Design a protein around this ligand. Structure first.
Ligand SMILES: CCc1c(C(=O)Nc2cccc(S(=O)(=O)N(CC)CC)c2)[nH]c(C)c1C(C)=O
Length: 126
């Protein structure tokens, strides 16, 4: 079965607005979200629906853009690096579970390339 999705709010953490965090939502996340190959990454992998019984045996740190989007909207992240790390985990999971040349791997590669193009212009830390 599926685990609960990653937490998207933290009642026990203070919250702040920053140019970097707002950029990660409105520019980085928004641009990847609208890419033709974003769809397999817009929500947690549903291993029951997809019939992938070993997915959560292999992937113990799941992550997806739907979670990242909610985390940004909810001010879950204090440091911009926390968000960048979540994107990295999402891509790395894909490379762990799947094989070279799989459709999903090509889709991750396109997204990851776009991600690097967008974080290139991340505002400086304040
Ligand atoms: C290859 C399986 C996979 C997906 C994926 O999402 N594939 C998917 C395929 C068909 C339907 C649905 S779906 O029914 O859940 N669906 C309707 C279209 C989405 C709304 C999802 N994502 C990742 C990161 C992986 C892996 C294993 O790395």
């Amino acid at each position: 079965m599926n685990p609960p999705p990653p937490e998207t709010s933290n009642p026990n953490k203070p919250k702040r607005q920053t140019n970097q965090l707002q950029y990660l939502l409105r520019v980085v996340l928004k641009t990847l979200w609208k890419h033709q190959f974003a769809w397999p990454f817009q929500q947690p992998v549903d291993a029951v629906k997809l019939n992938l019984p070993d997915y959560y045996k292999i992937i113990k740190t799941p992550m997806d853009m739907g979670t990242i989007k909610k985390r940004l909207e909810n001010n879950y992240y204090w440091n911009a690096q926390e968000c960048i790390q979540d994107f990295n985990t999402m891509f790395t999971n894909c490379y762990i579970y799947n094989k070279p040349g799989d459709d999903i791997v090509l889709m991750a590669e396109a997204l990851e390339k776009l991600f690097l193009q967008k974080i290139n212009e991340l505002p400086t830390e304040e």
